[PDB]
Write a protein that binds this ligand. Structure first.
Ligand code: SF4
Length: 204
């Protein structure tokens, strides 16, 4: 009776989960958004990556990480030599939350994050990843609690006992943060993202 939970079907099939998410009304965000954006990859993936929400391009492409942030992330994954076939990539909330200016993303509230978390739990349960990479604060707090700071713990192998399957957890920055800033800072941050991805990839 809470959030998206009744919209989630009793199957681990990612195709069926994604179809069902197309119908979710688990919070208000389905109203203005074009469609739900489910994650992508297969259930044998070892590494799950969780961003914050679909962006402008993702909302219309119907897949996660197709915009500039995805291209930067792809460059980081390549530099970490993580095979893109080992990846299931998704977001903490599945409907683009936005405003327009004369589309701009707006932060999902904790309520929206918790409302949508059943989809994320269904994905984690379906994929059974060895490691979950949390890309930025919103994703991290979904799983690690609303007080958690990515800045104080990024690149640490974490395990919290209330997360299904007890996967290793590695929090890092969201790739969108590495698009706007000074070059030396963007280059320094890029190297830290590669580092955090390598930590996650070396689990097991
Ligand atoms: S953001 Fe998540 S909970 Fe809210 S309507 Fe979309 S799929 Fe359902």
């Amino acid at each position: 009776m809470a959030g998206a939970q009744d919209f989630v079907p009793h199957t681990a099939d990612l195709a069926e989960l994604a179809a069902a998410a197309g119908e979710c009304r688990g919070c208000g965000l389905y109203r203005d958004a074009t469609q739900a954006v489910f994650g992508a990859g297969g259930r044998s993936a070892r590494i799950m990556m969780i961003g914050n929400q679909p962006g402008d391009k993702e909302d219309l492409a119907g897949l996660p990480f197709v915009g500039p942030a995805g291209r930067l992330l792809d460059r980081a994954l390549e530099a970490a030599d993580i095979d893109r076939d080992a990846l299931y990539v998704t977001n903490a909330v599945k409907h683009f939350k936005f405003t327009r200016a004369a589309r701009i993303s707006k932060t999902p509230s904790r309520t929206e994050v918790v409302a949508c978390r059943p989809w994320l739990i269904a994905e984690m349960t379906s994929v059974e990843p060895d490691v979950v990479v949390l890309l930025g604060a919103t994703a991290a707090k979904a799983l690690l609690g609303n007080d958690f700071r990515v800045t104080q713990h990024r690149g640490e192998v974490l395990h919290v006992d209330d997360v299904p399957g007890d996967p290793a957890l590695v929090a890092t920055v969201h790739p969108s943060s590495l698009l706007r800033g000074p070059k030396e800072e963007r280059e320094s941050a890029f190297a830290g993202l590669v580092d955090d991805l390598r930590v996650a990839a070396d689990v097991r």
